Amino acid sequence: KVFGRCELAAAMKRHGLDNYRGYSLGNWVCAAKFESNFNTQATNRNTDGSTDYGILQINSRWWCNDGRTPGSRNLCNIPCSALLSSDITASVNCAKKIVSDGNGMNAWVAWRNRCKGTDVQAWIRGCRL
Numbered sequence: 001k002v003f004g005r006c007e008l009a010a011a012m013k014r015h016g017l018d019n020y021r022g023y024s025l026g027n028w029v030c031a032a033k034f035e036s037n038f039n040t041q042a043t044n045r046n047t048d049g050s051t052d053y054g055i056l057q058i059n060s061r062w063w064c065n066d067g068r069t070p071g072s073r074n075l076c077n078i079p080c081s082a083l084l085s086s087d088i089t090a091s092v093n094c095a096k097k098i099v100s101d102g103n104g105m106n107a108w109v110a111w112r113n114r115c116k117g118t119d120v121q122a123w124i125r126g127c128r129l
């Protein structure tokens, strides 16, 4: 699924990401935009042979099993393909465990380079939330 901006903001809010570990809803929306373009099906290989999955580009190096990332962890206890669903539950719950692990949203390279220290409020402008 490719979400609309406000449609994704509403789903993320419903799922509790809103000010989760202090990150306002617009940070999450901005991260999704720059990670996946709001597309739940997005996949992208990393240089180390891991892959990033879904709307939040969750890495198989640590968080999920894709059957082709040797000596990696699966800390969300899920197949990475779960992260590609039209339903974002698995992605959001996994993201909660990622952001909570001590480095915050900096785990998301697109967030750190494109969203951090910007007016992320603009990502939820106009949305009925």
Ligand SMILES: [Au+]
Pocket (backbone or CB within 6 Å): 121
């Ligand atoms: Au403001």
